[PDB]
């Protein structure tokens, strides 16, 4: 089940998670996909329809949709892997 | 001061910070409002 994710920085992604599993498994997939540096299980929180998801409760209990979005946040730090000018590897053109 | 001493509630913070001014509770309430509005609640304050 391909839940759409949204961040506090207003970035958006998707997570193909098993709806047979609990909210802890959604957290596991987020840590798996984004890495422990961005979103560790122990530091991320999960929010749907204005309510925090209980990690031990199942995904079906909140009727999460694929086209709608869940919100994920991470406490204390706010740093992320920003990009840089990839053109530096050539810095010239055919023109 | 001998003036009327009242103020104008007509104004406020339009564009929220990138979390820099918000407590953990305020960062949470911002997270709530986003998913709540996605759930079609129409930007109301009613969290349930």
From Swiss-Prot, chain A:
The keyword Cell cycle does not apply. Its main location: nucleus. It comes from the Eukaryota. GO terms for molecular function: damaged DNA binding; DNA damage sensor activity; polyubiquitin modification-dependent protein binding; proteasome binding; RNA polymerase II cis-regulatory region sequence-specific DNA binding; RNA polymerase II-specific DNA-binding transcription factor binding; single-stranded DNA binding; ubiquitin binding. Coiled coil: none annotated. It is found in: Nucleus; Cytoplasm. GO terms for cellular component: cytosol; nucleoplasm; nucleus; proteasome complex; XPC complex. One of its GO terms (biological process) is nucleotide-excision repair. The keyword Transmembrane does not apply. Residues 1-79 form the Ubiquitin-like domain. Keywords: Cytoplasm, DNA damage, DNA repair, Nucleus, Phosphoprotein, Proteasome, Repeat, Ubl conjugation pathway. Belongs to the RAD23 family. Multiubiquitin chain receptor involved in modulation of proteasomal degradation. Binds to polyubiquitin chains. Proposed to be capable to bind simultaneously to the 26S proteasome and to polyubiquitinated substrates and to deliver ubiquitinated proteins to the proteasome. May play a role in endoplasmic reticulum-associated degradation (ERAD) of misfolded glycoproteins by association with PNGase and delivering deglycosylated proteins to the proteasome. The ubiquitin-like domain mediates interaction with ATXN3. Component of the XPC complex composed of XPC, RAD23B and CETN2. Interacts with NGLY1 and PSMC1. Interacts with ATXN3. Interacts with PSMD4 and PSMC5. Interacts with AMFR. Interacts with VCP; the interaction is indirect and mediated by NGLY1. This is UV excision repair protein RAD23 homolog B. It comes from Homo sapiens (Human). The lineage of its organism: Eukaryota, Metazoa, Chordata, Craniata, Vertebrata. The chain holds residues 1 to 87 of 409 of the full protein.
Curated annotation (Swiss-Prot), chain B:
Residues 23-42 form the UIM domain. Residues 28-32 are annotated as: Essential for ubiquitin-binding. The modification Phosphoserine is found at residue 7. It comes from the Eukaryota. The 2 UIM motifs are involved in the binding to a multi-ubiquitin chain in a cooperative way. Component of the 26S proteasome, a multiprotein complex involved in the ATP-dependent degradation of ubiquitinated proteins. This complex plays a key role in the maintenance of protein homeostasis by removing misfolded or damaged proteins, which could impair cellular functions, and by removing proteins whose functions are no longer required. Therefore, the proteasome participates in numerous cellular processes, including cell cycle progression, apoptosis, or DNA damage repair. Belongs to the proteasome subunit S5A family. Component of the 19S proteasome regulatory particle complex. The 26S proteasome consists of a 20S core particle (CP) and two 19S regulatory subunits (RP). The regulatory particle is made of a lid composed of 9 subunits, a base containing 6 ATPases and few additional components including PSMD4. Interacts with NUB1. Interacts with SQSTM1. Interacts with UBQLN4. Interacts with UBE3A. Interacts with UBQLN1 (via ubiquitin-like domain). Interacts with DDI2. This is 26S proteasome non-ATPase regulatory subunit 4. The gene is PSMD4.
